[model samples]
Target chain A: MRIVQPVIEQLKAQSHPVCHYIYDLVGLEHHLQHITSSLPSNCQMYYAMKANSERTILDTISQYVEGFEVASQGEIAKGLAFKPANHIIFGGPGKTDEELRYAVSEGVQRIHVESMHELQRLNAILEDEDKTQHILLRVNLARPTQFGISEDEVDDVIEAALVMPNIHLDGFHFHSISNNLDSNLHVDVVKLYFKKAKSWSEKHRFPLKHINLGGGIGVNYADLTSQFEWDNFVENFKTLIVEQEMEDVTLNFECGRFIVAHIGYYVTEVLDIKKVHGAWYAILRGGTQQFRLPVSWQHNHPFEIYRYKDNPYSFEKVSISRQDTTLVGQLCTPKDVFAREVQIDAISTGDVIVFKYAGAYGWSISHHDFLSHPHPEFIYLT
Target chain B: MRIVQPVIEQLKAQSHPVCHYIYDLVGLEHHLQHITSSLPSNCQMYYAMKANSERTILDTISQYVEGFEVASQGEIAKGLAFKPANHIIFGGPGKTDEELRYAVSEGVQRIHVESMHELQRLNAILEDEDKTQHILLRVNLARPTQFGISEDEVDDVIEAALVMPNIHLDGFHFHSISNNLDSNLHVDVVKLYFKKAKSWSEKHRFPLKHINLGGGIGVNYADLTSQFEWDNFVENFKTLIVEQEMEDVTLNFECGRFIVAHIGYYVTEVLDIKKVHGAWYAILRGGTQQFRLPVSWQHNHPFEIYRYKDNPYSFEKVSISRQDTTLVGQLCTPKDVFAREVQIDAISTGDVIVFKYAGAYGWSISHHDFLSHPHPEFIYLTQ
Candidate 1:
């Protein structure tokens, strides 16, 4: 992991008790360059804005990615504001009627319809406007899979989609899993979806123009060794797309966490360090409400300590010995813990704690007004 | 248990999904009245505003509780705006120098100092201002306890507080546990704290005016049968307060969740109902980002289904068979679940889901901006 000079310079400029989120756009651009180079021309990559929808982030990735995948009306508007509406795909489990209508009116590339009820609603809305909309039926496989439609319900949905006057069935969307680490397993699953969609297109005698295999390219926040082998996965996908003779089908990978998680960092200063019942507890000026990924996923976020011990307050200094430390936010509940009982180096009162890989789902997923604490400063470095 | 007529009317008035919170102030007032009536005159109850700090909630609670227990500077302003500054006592583990100064300048009745470092900082600030400030040393007990200064560090903190010229050590604040269910155990613990504070005051030769046994009076969100027995606890407490014969020491109960949890309800309409794998999953318009207690505490929030099958959209009707169901919110992740695999009535899309006991830590503790969803509407009923 390369720590840019500008990021280091920016951190040094801040005073004690600083709470900020620094995003390295230059690093993000380089990572995206590597990702795009690894992908084949048949695969279309859309940045999932749900990860981090800041306009600057959207603008930074706009030049690299093919399009954006939005889950809400706000996200759709945000994506459309940057690129053409045809370059975006809107999808979610509980999209409202207004959101559906906005997606149609904006002429989004494809709407991943989740249920029969949603398909009918979209068709009716399109009929009201006297327009035809392109859509991909989102199928939920039974058993282990939790999202999309069951296999049994697929034929009926597709049969209905064939007759709907205002709806055009473009392809199928299978986005069942998330945070998958095994690149080979991902390729295997994508292969299954491709085979199934191809067979269904042949059986139904409908041209399957696209197969949207939803993003599960996971980022290993705790252990980088377990991260998705992007190059290997891309290589396998390139072979599968060609050997299977699937050059006609455009495969969509709507990845959000994988694209943005590596570029962001959540930084906070320790206000007090104390020993509580034989364990060291470092309390930060900000808490989980501002950066909720650790608490949401129930994983210890990887962090680094920048120690500063030149305080003149005569406050008791923490011991020099390494010990098990628990990092908690300023919230009043025990649930406000960011990290629990992790061993760390000599930590003090004025030390800076940088929570790495916080760019995605950090501020956007957090409950910022929990205790009416101040929001963190957003700093973007190019 | 009283579903007020206005609350029913408000739910019925919504055309689209009704993701909102209804707080029963009249119920809160009556409950507060009963609680105060049962308690002895020596007890002081301060509403912990960290639980829910809405302006209406603060204003409504002002007439019932003795004072407000604030955790942050924003809460201090809210408390002061409702009543006098002396009625508020600021307490937190990570209080900044500005917050301590603000508490001092506002002349707060007491500041619960958590650490010796905090005590030294407060004394320095008070000395700089040429003023004497009242403070209660927050003690952290060793092993099996959660918060406050550690037991080993307590003596040093007290010794320093005694000599500090600008700081007046009023008493001790022992607030370790939270969401404690057993009332007998709660009263027993309170009794032990009273004895300890009385003995500590006598030994240290300092007047321990206040013994703040912080609020952990729990509300049974999961099981109503095991609700806190307030009547029995209060009777036992009244007897113990008199039997202990400690009339001079003011026992402060900083009660927040116990007072407000029961009076609040989180209501949302089911947006979609689907059979995921083998279980029923009902997705709502709002999610854990707004009402996060169930997710935060990892408990199945007790809820009721108000079914409405009158929609003409020709949507797939949910089966009427009683089955296991999970309740999820509008967010994009699996962590947005509110209830997991609970036996629920035949629920469907366009039906109303009323989550009980959400008044405390419902909206305030949630990450409201997650996925940029619409915020819930706040409705307060007087009767």
Candidate 2:
């Protein structure tokens, strides 16, 4: 959260006047170390690379987490390039045969199969290769989650997977909720999944080795104080692991947003400031094309202003006292708004706007080709 | 919007199993000809290139419209590359010094001045070159519009521009409305702007030669019945143009979406079809990544489904009859939804979904690099 003066100076001294994505690897390491140290021994942590697949970011987190959770071929390739294929787990709703072939051929540790059609396709591919693959059935818990196979279909899928010669059904993968802020609710969901898995394994006469409670830990963009109670959730999870009598089962946590959201900053320079229709506007050189999280989430991303007095157009003080100003990007559409009608300090042209907590779901998820604008520079400070 | 069978067969025969943007240039020419034929002589139509800036699209519209109205240096370069620089008008809120220098040196017809700081910068550049440049003062009208210079600051800006030796104020540019459905309200705004411009020009003793009513003509993406009545708009526009007593003055309409929205089709193939949580979901090879209008506007785009019979995995009928289905793309996020809970025929995995009204604001305005998906192919049907 504390950006040193040299980092700002380094960004300002860049070659081009475009926006830059400044990341602190040391900060990411500190957060991950704190998280991993607090987790129980039975719990295994996997960094969901879909949040951010940067080579340097993955390399930094490799020393802390167990492995990665990838969703696409591109992410699988990114994870494998950083670590061994056995450390990566592939899961998504729609996985093509090419992706499944690549995942199986690479000897990935586990593939979370989503539907009956997908399981059949994967079985066919593995049958052709004459190899047995470890797999987890991704079940959409009927009540709380919105995605996954129906609850009634879970037993049938498990019974069918058990008979397949080339497939190994390790356990169930439940990841339906997104951005769940309550620690108790998140832990409750995990406990419920453990109980259901036990009942299902007993009814099907199959032993389970792993239960992948897919990551839904969320970061509070509106108020940082309301962040997912990680320590509380960990303490509760340790009790449930024993209470459910599942001490032998290895619980996997594949998280993406929570681990990286706070370590990156989206820094943009103010291009112009004007008052139109009773609203002050600060236009930036970069818009949602570079970072679409604010617009995607529909939340006013937290930002700070650093004024520059060296420029000739610098205003030490505005003519009007503190007014409501809207921050917009260089794109021509009205949808390019970052912040709207928020009271702030008098912002002048050539000022720097530092948007905090952009480490996850930032640049990689944005539409970089809109209007053919130049991409933002990526800067990592160790 | 009728897509012939050969076009569908040709697209399915392509190499890559991804999305394609199919444009009917013959259809575009026909529509453009129809629009231009009915317009009065005093009214000038400028194609707003921001809608869809494919090079071939610009080249096709070049012979129809009067000129190009560009918003950025990229568009200005695109415009000048196809035609002479003098035929393009450059306008934007954040024009950098480099863009301003390039615009002035390239002999662009007019630069829409947005603010006092912009005017000073432009004047300084023109002063340094010792050349006089013509500019349209971009005034954000106070009422009946959302964007522009304040109503109070119009006089001060005009007075300042009149005194500058290197600046020549030709007229005013008022563009604030967006995607308006009513044809009556659109012409009413134009009439009001004309009255305001006439009164201001008379009071300031500055004769106005051009009045650029910037583009805001809407396209009906949700329902075809709510479409902006082009015939009604043109008929009403002519009456107002003659009644305003501005037959000699040139009125510029810079349109982007209306001219091109109905001319293109976004064709994407289905990757997988699954029932998740009691809802039928059809996963497409392309989602909001290739075309973001459905998600951006928060409305289900009108689309038609074409079943493939020759495919090995084709299913003639799904057990779940007609029901609400959610159409999504390949991206990992939940916001990649193109349509949420719409009733449609049973769609299998190999089915094709052709989203109509995608000619404008289609690929050019989308985020193509999300998850590093392959870009869509651009196909044009001449006949």
Candidate 3:
């Protein structure tokens, strides 16, 4: 049985309509265990909290991962609730002075520096506190968007950080893009990271103890059967580690999506079904407000229908066959659609919809309070 | 004076922290009164709660507007608390059985039905209750997106509704786009709506009592001096009503954005200012989480800097001059930006940044619970 069916079997008895985020803790632990067992000695797997930082998920993930990756102050405080200072690494382009103080006081050893001004900003904070903080310069691959030091400014950042009295240039953070599905492209990006860091460290006569190749591993939403090939990726990473002679240098992979995407599922109950303009649409109790990853990333998220054995409608239960059905959420906006024109083997009103690969960046990044709608329940499976 | 200066002067005394949405009730009342007074007798204005549905706003807006236009049950409930069922018109593509029950039991008369299936959906509820309900068939002009009935299927809907035991075809609702800027374009759209509706009503020998020329009145965010010429619109509308020889046909304008967009201001303190790669980016205590209208609509929201007399930073106050600044929010993702590459005359750290034209769709549509950030304060001003 797939992840959706087993989860549905467990949740099948509830009389009330079902809408929630289900995190399979056992599946997560096993997946994390497998990843850690395969990872090379140099690579330290840190779970980024931005993806999904639910308390149970964090607690379960904490038992398996080495550290927690946090960006904002709220996430930092959440990370501190579990792991200690040395394990937690903070990264964000627009970090506030308050966040820096909180991270420093909480004993966060490594903070990713995003700009030259922030290099000085963090250096000043460390100097004022009479403490030294290790920083990894976060470089942008040019998104025409703000955040990160420009690629050309890497040397300039290195020159600036080497002179700072309280700041140590631990490494460089290259978290360029998000939701990239290609394993080979990720390895190539990793190779590029090693090649550049190798050149930069040699040129500056700097001892690079750590190289943080931030997570770019994407999730396959169209077909859950296929995935971001982890075995081949780990194999390529193992070669890259040895070939670059960085066996001693600590490499960090702060993966949020890849580590947790498979273990989570968003199950929203069908509220209404309408056939209009020669097409079918199933209205969900929840919409983009609860799980915005599909629309935000613009993909018809992979999903399955868990048909209700008991029809809970006064009217005839709506069922669509052999026609494409657009899954819509119960928000007032037109943007509330999750999956559009996706074919379904069979679907009916009052049935449960299980959106696979919704563990990370699903609930975490959504505009949850947009409509003042009731929150979907968060269920943890042991 | 600009709206920012008066607000800053009033809020100059508060010291602990400054981050909240300020709604000038006096300003809103005046705006609403001016709109209602200038409207053609055939046209009625209803405030849509999706824009800014603060309780005080609904109460204040109720005194001037004819009715309230709501989509969700939450908004519908909120609308009923202030206005009666006859004054509330519910519209949305997806309405639950529970919502339909709430509307029917609560004595809601007018419901904008988006589909022929929904017209039947409402009819089923009304029939079960052994009551009658009025419906305005919401038709789509072709967004290549969902919502609204197809243009070709108007006759089928009329035919379907006439046979329903407890349903009456009141009229049609044509709400097409959002944040559109041109008054002439909106008028042109309204004209097309009347043209099609006229043909359909005459063809079917059906009496169309309501024609909701749904709100597409765009707000000019760039220049506050310019506005959605209401006088011109009402004049053009008055002429259209007289020319059509249908002054009694209730034409409704349920504008949420145009009615409320200019009355609210988002005031957040500038936490940090960084000059990165020859670009000035000021990070605010708030971001898209609190007020997401700018980035969500993909336009640089017009704003101004309210300078503080006292310096709050231990470090040198970061200020920018003659440079294009990107105003970012305090969220974890890059999507937290509000305005991008817009030129600022002058700005500095610790000074309050005021995003004008955020009265509607500013606070209502944002992802408030994202990243577990603190909620902004809601302030109301009296004349």
Candidate 4:
């Protein structure tokens, strides 16, 4: 909650157009501790680098998380630089041979196998290496996405991997959906993964040791007051593991947004504010080009007005007093909006707008070079 | 029409997994010649650089178009580097003093004033200048958009600017909607701008010398065979200008998409092909990060399969034999789709998909470094 204050104070020292990203390393450290402190020894948290791949963020998270989960070759390299190969897990649907080879040769902890073709490719590549690589087969859920191996084909994958010289058919990886809010439903999904793993392992008598519940712990963007019940979740999950006597099995959570979303802020100054038709609109110095998580998801990213008292324009800066203002970007399109019709007590031109929970998926997933605007300056608070 | 062939053949020379953008400069040149060949002297084409700022595309269009229309300060410098100051027109909603001063100092073509506040800002910035700068007032159309000055504030803007010592207040600028398909309706909108301008100019006796019809010409992604009827539009638009006795007035079509959309293509190889829940999905090497035009507009971008005859995978590449396949990108989200459920006669993994009409907003407006994927190779072919 107080993360933006230190950033805002530091921001005041500069007199530029006032738009950049602020990452609170201390805040992130605290949040990571809160999450990992109660984590069971059987479970481990892996920083999902795709969410926000800034090197500083990665370096800070490496100290807290047990490992790192990378999807592509570049991400694998980034992860390898911080931790040893044994502390990394590789997974993605479209894992190219280039990506797999790097992961296999680098001796990453495991590669979550998505398709039979992937299994075959791994074995073929493994012939060149002296050692065998451990892997968790990704079982596609009932939802017909193009991600995982179908349940019908799981047996085929198991059978295929058993014959492969290099692959250690270890366990299963299940990532049902992203940003799910319900804690009960998540626990149920975990139970299902456990049930399926035990049921299949007993049937085939194959040793199943690891379960990667690929991270989908939701962050409440709609209501920042509410969050994914982590304490409750940890309690229930630990209870389930104990009750079911799930022994010697390591559970991994490759979390992205929920871990780092709260510690960062996207701060942009209001360039102009005016009434269009009947509604008040405050155009910002930057927009969806810098932070596209809101626009791509079609949700109002939470923000507050950080009024910088300065009349920097030729004429008086236009503003809105006690009104619902739609914050728009300077892009040519109307869809280049950050927040839509949010309640604002008062907002003026030159006042900074601090959008919270922007640490993940804001910068990394955005269209940076869209109108050839200057990129937002990245400021990190150590 | 055959713009992508030379580029495709060139693409085959490389052995790595393929994904890149191709701009047929020769095709752009030919098309530009065709579009400008029959144009009236009163009307001139201005290349909107925001569409695709590939230097080659800009360099080619400069030969055919009269001027370059820029929206940002970066674009202003880009245009200035290519063409003279007089050949560029500056316009956008948020014009920073930094940008305005550059345009004012550079003496670029008239700045399009959007609001009364902008008029004030320009005059304020203009006071430091020894010479006066020409301006076109942007009258916001009858839409609830945040762009142009409201209809009620037109008189306010005129009176405010008329008194400003350094302002010229040359004419008017109107851009109603983007990607509007109806040519007849566009002509009607043009007529409305003419009617409004003539009425206001006649009443106030102000010199209405230039009218900037900001570019919103649509490209037919749904059906590639048909396109914005440029010839018909030109013929009808010329007739309107003549009938209205609109002499000494320059009409500028700030076009972006219509000019270069067809001359470019985004080609990505099929990395994975599989059926999910009884529906075929062809995953590409690149998705919305390289070409976001179709996904942003939520339209099915037209494409054709160029079967690269090789089994590159460990297993025989998964084949979708004469089936309807949804082409997707390797992105994690479900929304990262190019063409959804388009009927494909035959497609297989490791083949290339050539997405047409990608010259405009394909690379320029996309999230390039989204997944830390390598940037697409840019190829330009000249005759």
Candidate 5:
């Protein structure tokens, strides 16, 4: 389906001239609604702030969603500026004492415990303040079917987490990466981790309140056709959890790139044209400063070229005809290739092309501005 | 050869916690001196500012070198601040009008022309002010067997440059990428482009004074033993030009990376360790922001992690065990790979590891600590 016309006009009015793409905020909202509505009411959706930490977007979503999942102190600050501090869920492998203290000071909802060292750091600070920390022990469950943390380390991590005094082991958090969304694997992981949490609650009389199924629902960047299977995923998950009689537990679902990836696009203009060793080359105005997702990621951000002012949505693929057309950046190196000889629509000087699905990793996360292009500006429409 | 003990001790004092490999800097300086001293004197060496525009290093080299070559207004401003504006050779494919006007106003020694469009832009501004511009038409000499520009475009670009009333085509510029310091290609390129310039000068009766052969002498970043062959390079180049009896032509040479690459080293501390999939991973304090050379050049700048305190110049190699180790920057995820699966000595948490030969593309070019890691401070020795 075509993007709404009003959003396009609004984008043009505010977008910087050298900006190469338009990220549709409304599209993200639509996707989120589609994903959330299918899940049970108890399954609280926490937006991962790293996905699209643009202030306005997070603020708008905070009004609707349960809370936010923050990694860095910056992310925590961003969440607190919009959402209530108590609504934030801080989680990552490493958390500095300052970040932990900041979250504790704000009286955040819970700290997802990754390492034993982190729990000790948090508990010590909380105890010093005469406060009890609400904790979600991140159960590093190892599924023999996939590459992840070993089962032995998972037990050790949970065991270490239980000993911390100020930490009220309130929930169990499990995250797994897979090629396909396997309901069985998710059930297996949850069953193992939740069982461990239940054991802690029974042994120590610490009441377990919540369970976080960290989002690993990958939106295919290569295949733009396949819609996010939210209805099937939520229904299947809800059915499995309800069957196990664990339906009383509050579920916290964290969706990162899936919610915001398709909404954004990076726009760039063609700078110079050359043919090196029988291969055509087109130099671009933008570089890693704007859209560095592709370089870091093995996956390419879905992109399209549009002739400026004529038909912005018209996708005419520009690929290397005779030989590969290498796209060089303005930076003085052969390294900066935004897209490697991919099909682009007739990209001439000043013809802005859209790097789609960049909302997740575009602006703050991967920006460098090494060759001196202005930072990307953002716009939001209800 | 080991770095001076005094340099190491000073570095250790200054780079606390973040331990710099002073020995690497010594090795890099040795590499540069070998390459530069061999080039002809008339081959006026101009450091390409972007390669590693460290202020202390540039100002120090301004003593030995003739001038600098810059591509940006920021670079221009930096060059102007460091040395006389006349020593600056302003060149790049895309020179904005403001930059062109500033170059003329500053009375820069020469403006390297890239396109016909730029010639028109330069002439219009210079004409409005009634100032004459000394221009070097940057022609693709088909050197290193790669075309910087087409042969057909050269005639038109020169013709366009000649018609401009305020523009004086002083000479022609030739730039070619060379894999090695084979001075033969330099000689070959100089001959071809100068022949073109010679023909134009003979016909127009305007004797050309400047012909610049831009720097592309690559550095051997891998091993310290492999020195760049500059003697052969200088001999072949100077031999050809001198033999051709091309006198009264002030030959210009642009060399920057080879000079500064060795003088700097990126020093970082080991943060944490994780063993996964049967290999150890050492998370360093450094990332792509500090050492961007490695990321852009996956094939090059494979950093040698050295003990910060005292190294006997004995080769201790550390292999990047994982092709993809999760390199977390101080920020979220800008260019985080400090050298994936980068090997070194038994690096524990708090042990400082040095990234050798980091001077050229370190600290100065596009580095933003998106997170709060303080910028690198540079140290220089007087000539």
Candidate 6:
């Protein structure tokens, strides 16, 4: 991602009914360079399509990343827009027959099975096509993966995946809190996984060709450049496999947000200035209708990093005069209140205020105009 | 009221769309020149049409120190769009048609009385077509004048004023705060009449020319403001009337928020580094809808206000990494939250944020949407 000063100016000049998203193109390219360098010689990294399916972001990654991990038909169609048909892997909690049939027709990669019903459904489609399907069994670990589902439902889902004849278990995939926030946690989990893999092979007499540690190497946003200590993370992983005497298994990682979240922000303007009681209140112009994140989820937005054209450097220590200063919108209800008693520079009549890191959940889950504001404008920058 | 350079920039160079309100300027010049300054040299003021009757605000009095009082209808209309026809007065705790007739047609200096029966069944109005009315009576003063309804109920029904056609009180009025917040409290109880005038004049058997007294004087917004010597306020009034010392008199002062709460702030935003959360959770962008004030009221509204671009010099931060950061919006409901565990510049997902100074019973009265992104632009500066 490369951003030129002129481009930034162009974006700043771009105005609309509401704040649109802008990417940091320059930062993106830099991140890609680091990520590519960190990849294993043979291991492949697939961008989870759902993390960010922005056409621009996907178009850039498609040039280098292997493929994408999709969970729905919509995602599959979207991923296909960026890469070849063979580059997609459709996997999710529930798989509809129609979806599997579509994947098959599209020549997609292996379909990860979640339930017996799904296995039968896929087999039926294959039987009709008289085709043998390549597939992967998503096994539930004894312990919950740091970000995966619990262990209890794993067995039934795994058993269901095994029922079909056209399917081949080319590799075993287990998602656990395997990737740790603390790099050390990964080593411990990796060691435990190898022992389990080895034991399973011995008891089941099934030949295993691959192992995928589903993605969760958290990007420490607290320190962006601290790229998850990958060297050590893999080093510990290799040691665990070596100790378990396991060999000849290919490794894989499914990754998402680590690549996209850093590139966006939600910007807005101040609406009103009121002195209730005595505190100055600068009501936000863009209400929950345009950007739901600040209201619907109760998440705090980062304001400091958002570059203000000519920002405020000082402030009068003031109180919010209203106990619950109604930070309302153009709507007719008083329910709006992004944050109750926030401290900022003395907001006057009209100030341009921007919300940092507003790319992801900003508009996806929200609805508008059944009664409210305008739709969000998608601006892909970095 | 003036604006500096930076503020003007802020007003224009914002990231979102803007909506404007012209409601406040409905009545301007006349209120300032005619109402605020001109008045009989001997009388105190009584212009209590709720302090914020949009039009009334426009009406300014020229006499810097003159006092004005109000209660409900009569004063409210005067506040917004005034007519020289209205004479200021205080009417508290229910009104009477007989009194209104005597006040309306007869054009009495001031007439305020309580009890619906008096305005209806009690007083006489049919025979006074040519005569002028005069007197002060109490309206409903049960609730605090600061609130609505509970204190401003008519002593009689709507028909009471109509029946009093022959009698027009020169001073029309209502009461001030008892213990609530309302347009009603802006009306003072005795700004139109004085107790001493009613008592001593009655004893002397001398019919008073003009007399009425309203209720409550509004204090400043701060606790500290309240502490400002009451002696000064009282002395100021006493000194103004020192020369006249009329035996018959009326006076009123309706006040509320001035004597109640002080304001505060509401500040908040995203935290962490890079900005995505799962498939949907993204960076923090949206803010609170609006600070809900007057939450106690059953009504709701998505409020609007002015934004200031003072060029206050604030630093810019961006999201470095994209993990665990949550995005948020401003409503108080769960759907109100925008995104969760998102990433940004310094704070990464899961950081607690704040919006400053949101008191004033905001939630008690307003709705939940108007203050959306690209909101109404407005602000007010006062002396």
TM-score of candidate 2 relative to the true fold = 0.93
Per-chain TM-score, chain A, candidate 2: 0.95
Q: Model 4 segments beyond 4 Å from truth? A: A5-14, A128-131, B1-13, B129-131
Candidate 6 C-alpha lDDT tens digits along B183-209: 222322232334333443454444545
Residues B214-314, model 5: lDDT tens digits: 77777777676675666766777777777765667888877767677766666665544544444444555545555666765664354444444443212
lDDT of 5 at B374: 42
What is the per-residue lDDT of model 4 for residues B1-383, given as tens digits with 9 covering 90 to 100?
A: 26665566556666666788888888788888988877788788899888998887888888999889988778888887689999999887778777889899999888988776667777878887766899998888555666878777787778888888789888899887799777888888888989888877887778888898888999888877777787788889889888888867888888898899988889988777766667777778877888988889998898877877766445676776778778887777777888787899888777789998899888988988776766778888776
Which number leads on TM-score?
Answer: 4
User: What proportion of the true contacts does each candidate reproduce?
Assistant: 0.46, 0.34, 0.32, 0.42, 0.03, 0.00
TM-score of chain A of each: 0.95, 0.95, 0.95, 0.96, 0.84, 0.78
Residue-wise C-alpha lDDT for candidate 5, range A101-184, written one tens digit per residue: 888888889888754445666777887788878888665453221122334555565556668667777767776553244455
Task: Give Cα distance to truth, residue A162, candidate 4, Å.
Answer: 1.0
lDDT of 3 by residue, A1-382 (tens): 2656665666656565578888889999999999988998878899988888888899998988889988777887888788987899988766777778878877896999887766766777787899888889887753444667777778888998999878888888888777777888888888888888888898888998898898878888777777888899889889888887889999988998898898888998776676656777788887898898888778899887887777543557767787788889877777788988988888777788988888988988777756556688887878
Overall lDDT per candidate, in order of appearance: 0.82, 0.82, 0.81, 0.83, 0.62, 0.44
- What DockQ score does model 2 reach against the true complex? 0.40
Tens-digit lDDT track for model 6 on A239-352?
A: 666666555676667776566656666555443344422333444544555555556445344453123244222222222322423343332223344444555543432234
Docking class for model 2 is acceptable
Candidate 4's C-alpha lDDT? 0.83
Tell me the interface RMSD of model 6, in angstroms.
18.1
* Candidate DockQ scores, in order: 0.53, 0.40, 0.35, 0.57, 0.14, 0.01
* TM-score between candidate 6 and the true structure: 0.46
Query: Top lDDT: which candidate number?
Result: 4
Docking quality (DockQ) of candidate 3: 0.35
